[PDB]
Write a protein that binds this DNA or RNA. Structure first.
Ligand SMILES: Nc1ccn([C@H]2C[C@H](O)[C@@H](COP(=O)(O)OP(=O)(O)OP(=O)(O)O)O2)c(=O)n1
Ligand SMILES: [Ca+2]
Ligand SMILES: [Ca+2]
Ligand SMILES: [Ca+2]
Ligand SMILES: [Ca+2]
Ligand SMILES: [Ca+2]
Length: 903
DNA sequence: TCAGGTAAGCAGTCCGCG
DNA sequence: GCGGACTGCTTAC
């Protein structure tokens, strides 16, 4: 077995490394690593080090790391470039692990924990840590055990021991329903005092020192609280035992509105699961409480308790501890699904970085590129200071707002990375510039050919064609990994649809799910067996298929994020290879590609339809085109089709056999025009959309840029058992839109697209009639809340006060002088409700923390003064009016001469 | 909201628009 | 009332 690092730190002139040795044991070592840096030289031909531009360099080997850093300073004082990896631990890892790291996750100690702290006077601030820690549950991945540390005696109450027997029981037996599958994995330790609890926890920590430390808000709450509480009680040296190297640092985290403090534990990699989720889940949520996210991800019920959490330990210590345990498990369950820890380890070891650096695409790419170049004895340039400057991005076509009955979409594969590879865009491949014409001249192929020697982008940049740049080389490797995982994801998706189809005809038998790999398309034999299965077995298979799809999605979408992040890093001032010429070369080439192919598709379809100057491409954004297919369908005639699937098959064939070849030819011509290194503009059919055959559905509509809805039957080769609504940008997709309103608007859209005007009018009438019954949370708006202080003038709205902030100030006056009332946290999200004229709150709206019930102090008054009329017009009617006007439809039946008779 | 990028939509404030 | 300038917040890509 090859060795692999666990953590790496620089402390003074020493590297501290925890690692798994060749025998599979965890070890720690201190290494007086001597770094090398580089300087340009005339020079001797006997040097083997060259910078990325091929200029010779001499290697300077330093007695220690502090000397290397001081040399970098002097080179700045002199005014000369100091070359090489200035983050010495990355250099250390590169030297020590000079091969593709093969890691064994079963040897990596992954800990997730959660603490409880009873506090009668508001939120227990981690910086103060003035209240006892009264529960800790710490799950260890190697032991596969939940270690529970329970405080029985506190200034806030003495309690009895937690009972595992009651914990296991149904809530209907008076129990806590701790999942039976973890009951035998709980190791319960009660303590008669907090000093002994904390001393034992530290001893335990020493024995089972986390490598990866996770949980929910551990970086912002649990770690700082534990550290500071131990500091308060025992002193600093004891608190630093949370670090395997006894080194910690208060770190100030800054943003534009203010700052906060965290504790850096040297020799541990903290991956707070809230931040993993925010980065990798590709959701935007109304609330990020563990309860809310658990319900969203796992469909588990809210953990129910009576009274405030500040009195939960005293009133029901049994439930208090059970819910602490369950909280830790819910994070494990989310990870079992989303696999963000796996992803982080995968990417971290690939790049050869501290695992926690996966949060930084810039740090990730710096290490990948450094390691690649080092292999060639090439020397990386010094990072430089650059002023932040705006630069142009993608093209978006202005659509004509309308209904669109039949639509086929086409999309470029991994556009920006494909552009980088096609054009050969890299720091070291810049060949020069050419004289640019207006972009429209390149789009229309009337501008002079930029170069007969070099590979070009319409921003005026030229690149070498003799060899691949390091950016193209390394981006290709990750692109290839992404493609493999996307393949598994789509197969799992297709397999899921086979199971859905079979669920129409389930067998009345007792059987088991098939043991299959959902990452590969089901064979004919598997399909035959599926048709013979019970509903229970099919549903279990569907769950597993959907879990496989989620696993593939995590692996693929985040590799996509990383590669797109390299294109973005070229436009970030902190990136070692920051260059607006390269960043703009990518974006400007993309603008041309989209508009180039729009023209080619229009020309092609006008030719096949025998028309002149008709717009077949109705819309496009960045790298996709949406093509009106009404004329194609009408050329055979709707009456000629047996069913919906029949015209779907037909459009699918037309897209693949006629349109994609035309698109390919168009892009090959563009490649030769720009004299690019390799043709990589691959534009495949994405969606096939239309109304059900024989229906009055409108199929799709656009209201404007980034705002459209389509009834989709096939997506990237997945033929759905039921048509799928693809809605982009509209209020149904916005976290700010109330939950019940998202749901109602989506149904309005479904009816528009699938059923027609009359169906839409029927639903609207009913929703308008009944909406006042809806639960207040489901009809509250949601917003992030920044600069509460800025707009606060003696508890009242200052000039230009945003609506949601006004709501917070209303709330703040209403709960004033109440220490136990939930506080709105700056930078987090709130529910917002409008209030009727003459309410006791003294203003037109109120806001409270999102994901929560509003305090019982004011709940009744809020419910009584809720402005349902304003709520409805603003969140429901106004957006619907936008949808319907765009689609040339009415949500309310217009009067006609026909109505009425029947006397 | 510490942590790659730009384009661009809508809510709301403030106030003009004879 | 609607739009323009502007802030705030949110999506699409
Ligand atoms: N978060 C994002 C998403 C998009 N884009 C840019 C880079 C993409 O290449 C391009 C098109 O976005 P897509 O969503 O269509 O994604 P890709 O084309 O990269 O991947 P694919 O279509 O293969 O899934 O827009 C970006 O810079 N950052
Ligand atoms: Ca808790
Ligand atoms: Ca794409
Ligand atoms: Ca595709
Ligand atoms: Ca069957
Ligand atoms: Ca796209």
């Amino acid at each position: 077995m090859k060795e692999f690092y666990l953590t790496v730190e620089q402390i003074g002139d020493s590297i501290f490394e925890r690692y798994i040795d060749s025998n599979g044991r965890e070890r720690t070592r201190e290494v007086e690593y001597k770094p090398s840096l580089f300087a340009h030289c005339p020079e001797s031909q006997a040097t083997k080090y060259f910078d990325i531009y091929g200029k010779p360099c001499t290697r300077k080997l330093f007695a220690n790391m502090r000397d290397a850093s001081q040399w970098i300073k002097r080179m700045e004082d002199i005014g000369l470039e100091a070359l090489g990896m200035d983050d010495f631990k990355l250099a250390y890892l590169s030297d020590t692990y000079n091969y593709e790291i093969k890691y064994d996750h079963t040897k990596i100690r992954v800990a997730n924990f959660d603490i409880e702290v009873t506090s009668p006077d508001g939120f227990p601030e981690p910086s103060q840590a003035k209240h006892p820690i009264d529960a800790i549950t710490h799950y260890d991945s190697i032991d596969d055990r939940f270690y529970v540390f329970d405080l029985l005696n506190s200034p806030y109450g003495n309690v009895e021991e937690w009972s595992i027997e009651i914990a296991a029981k149904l809530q209907e037996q008076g129990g806590d329903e701790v999942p039976s599958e973890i009951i035998d994995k709980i190791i319960y330790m009660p303590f008669d005092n907090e000093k002994e609890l904390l001393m034992e926890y530290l001893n335990f920590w020493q024995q089972k020192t986390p490598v990866i430390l996770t949980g929910w808000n551990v970086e912002s709450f649990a770690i700082p609280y534990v550290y500071n509480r131990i500091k308060n009680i025992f002193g600093e040296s004891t608190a630093k035992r949370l670090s395997p190297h006894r080194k910690t640092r208060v770190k100030v985290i800054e943003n534009m509105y203010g700052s906060r403090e965290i504790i850096t534990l040297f020799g541990i990699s903290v991956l707070d699961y809230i931040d993993l989720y925010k980065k990798f889940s590709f959701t935007n949520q109304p609330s990020y409480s563990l309860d809310y996210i658990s319900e969203f991800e796992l469909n588990v019920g809210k953990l129910k308790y009576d009274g405030p959490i500040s009195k939960l330990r005293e009133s029901n210590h049994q439930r208090y501890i059970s819910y602490n345990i369950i909280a830790v498990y819910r994070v494990l369950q989310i990870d079992a699904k989303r696999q963000f820890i796996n992803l982080s380890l995968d990417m971290g070891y690939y790049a050869k970085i501290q695992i926690q650096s996966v949060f930084s695409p810039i740090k990730t790419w710096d290490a990948i590129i450094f390691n690649s170049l080092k292999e060639q004895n090439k020397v990386i340039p010094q990072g430089r200071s650059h002023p932040v400057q705006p630069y142009p991005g993608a093209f978006v076509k202005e659509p004509i707002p309308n209904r669109y009955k039949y639509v086929m979409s086409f999309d470029l594969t991994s556009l920006y990375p494909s552009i980088i590879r096609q054009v050969n865009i890299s720091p070291e491949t810049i060949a020069g510039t050419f004289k640019v014409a207006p972009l429209h001249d390149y789009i229309n192929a009337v501008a002079e050919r930029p170069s007969d020697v070099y590979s070009c982008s319409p921003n005026g940049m030229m690149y070498y064609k003799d060899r691949d740049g390091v950016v193209p080389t390394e981006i290709t490797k990750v692109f290839n990994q992404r493609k493999e995982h996307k393949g598994y994801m789509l197969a799992a998706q297709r397999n899921g649809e086979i199971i859905k189809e079979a669920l129409h005809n389930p067998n009345l038998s007792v059987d088991e799910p098939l043991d299959v790999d959902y990452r590969f398309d089901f064979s004919d034999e598997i399909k035959e067996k599926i048709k013979k299965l019970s509903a229970k077995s099919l549903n279990e298979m569907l769950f597993r298929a959907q879990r496989t799809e989620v696993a593939g999605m995590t692996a693929q979408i985040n590799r996509k994020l990383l590669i797109n992040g390299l294109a973005g890093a070229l436009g970030n001032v902190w990136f070692r290879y920051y260059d607006l010429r390269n960043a703009t070369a990518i974006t400007t080439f993309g603008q041309m590609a989209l508009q180039w192919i729009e023209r080619k598709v229009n020309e092609y379809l006008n030719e096949v339809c025998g028309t002149e100057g008709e717009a077949f491409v109705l819309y496009g954004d960045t790298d996709s085109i949406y093509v009106s297919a009404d004329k194609i369908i009408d050329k055979v005639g709707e009456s000629k089709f047996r069913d919906t699937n029949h015209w779907v098959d037909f459009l699918d064939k037309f897209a693949r056999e006629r349109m994609e070849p035309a698109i390919d030819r168009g892009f090959r011509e563009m490649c030769e025009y720009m004299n690019n290194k390799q043709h990589l503009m691959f534009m495949d059919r994405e969606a096939i959309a239309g109304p059900p055959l024989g229906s009055k559905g409108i199929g799709g509509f656009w209201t404007g840029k980034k705002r459209y809805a389509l009834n989709v039957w096939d997506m990237e080769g997945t033929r759905y058992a039921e048509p799928k609504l693809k809605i982009m940008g509209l209020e149904t997709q916005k976290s700010s839109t109330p939950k019940a309103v998202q749901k109602a608007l989506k149904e309005c859209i479904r009816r528009m697209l699938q059923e027609g005007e009359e169906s839409l009018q029927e639903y609207f009438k009913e929703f308008e009639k009944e909406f006042r019954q809806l639960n207040y949370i489901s009809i509250a708006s949601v917003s992030s809340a920044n600069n509460i202080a800025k707009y606060d003038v003696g508890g009242f709205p200052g000039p230009k006060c945003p609506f949601h902030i006004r709501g917070i100030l209303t709330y703040n006056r209403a709960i004033k002088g109440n220490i136990d009332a939930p506080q709105v946290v700056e930078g987090e999200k709130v529910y917002v409700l409008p209030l009727r004229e003459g309410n006791p709150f003294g203003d037109k709206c109120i806001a409270w923390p999102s994901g929560t019930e509003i305090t019982d102090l004011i709940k009744d008054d809020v419910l009584h003064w809720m402005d349902y009329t304003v709520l409805l017009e603003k969140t429901f009617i106004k957006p619907l009016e936008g949808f319907t006007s765009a689609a040339k439809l009415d949500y309310e039946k217009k009067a006609s001469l026909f109505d009425m008779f029947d006397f």
